[PDB]
Amino acid sequence: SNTQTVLPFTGLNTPSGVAVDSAGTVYVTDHGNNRVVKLAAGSNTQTVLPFTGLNTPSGVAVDSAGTVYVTDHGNNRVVKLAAGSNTQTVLPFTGLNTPSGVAVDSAGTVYVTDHGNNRVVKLAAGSNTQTVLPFTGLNTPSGVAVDSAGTVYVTDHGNNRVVKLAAGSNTQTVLPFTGLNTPSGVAVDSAGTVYVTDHGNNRVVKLAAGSNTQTVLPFTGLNTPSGVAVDSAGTVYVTDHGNNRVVKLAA
């Protein structure tokens, strides 16, 4: 599609992250209101998730069981909420400096861009032993995504680039995006196409796996977009941060 639609959220203050579950429910970190909201497919009325004590949340992810993971940026922590629960859990990450993005793989491992420590960390489900991924030369990373094979994709915000690291490899590569300006969000779909919010250029770009040729998605009117998600139908959801709204484009 080349016709975007604005999702019927309301009252957002510079939304920062977005995720979409297998039922098409859309989850958004409403950064400036210290809360996370969600909208079921077809619904015209959001609900607020029962997280507590959030300071300007920044990334969100949802797993196949509907558990919602949120980077509680201002409290240097990552929290999660199981489907139907009213009681969040704080994951046992330590030493985080204003975490930004979060991703969760098919094994339930949770990956966090530890923005202010220039690194990416992960915790296997149920573990309290965090691991620092062997990326090198990052500068305040901002988004993270993980594909079906466990390959990790990171927006290396301060270096205007996107890097990738296969599970068990110690050697990252740089994806051949071009002309990015402080990219923020990243998502990877089931085809391995990588989507990036090119924050400083007010646009969203994508790169098919193994291609050297990015394309610009036909969104309109974006103002410093911040997060991107892609559902199983290939619909692309973007937090249009500077316009206080979430937009989507069908495949």
Binding site for Zn ion (CB under 5 A): 14, 56, 98, 140, 182, 224
Residue closer to Zn ion by CB (options 140, 239) is 140
- Give least dist CB 79 to Zn ion, A: 16
Residue closer to Zn ion by CB (options 151, 159) is 159
- Give least dist CB 81 to Zn ion, A: 21
* CA nearest neighbour of 184 among 4, 31, 53: 31
Annotate 51-116 with DSSP letters as a single string.
--S-SS--EEEE-TT--EEEEEGGGTEEEEE-TT-S--EE----S-SS---EEE-TT--EEEEEGG
CA distance linking residue 146 with residue 56, whole number of Å: 24
Confirm if 186 and 198 have CB atoms less than 8 A apart. Answer: no
Residues 6 or more apart whose Cβ sits within 8 Å of residue 64: 22, 106
- Give least dist CB 233 to Zn ion, A: 29
Residue closer to Zn ion by CB (options 70, 147) is 70
Q: What are phi and psi of 77, to 5 degrees?
A: -150, 165
Residue closer to Zn ion by CB (options 98, 155) is 98
- Give least dist CB 166 to Zn ion, A: 27
Residue closer to Zn ion by CB (options 182, 239) is 182
Strand partners, 111: 103, 122
- Give least dist CB 199 to Zn ion, A: 5
* CA nearest neighbour of 152 among 141, 160, 66: 141
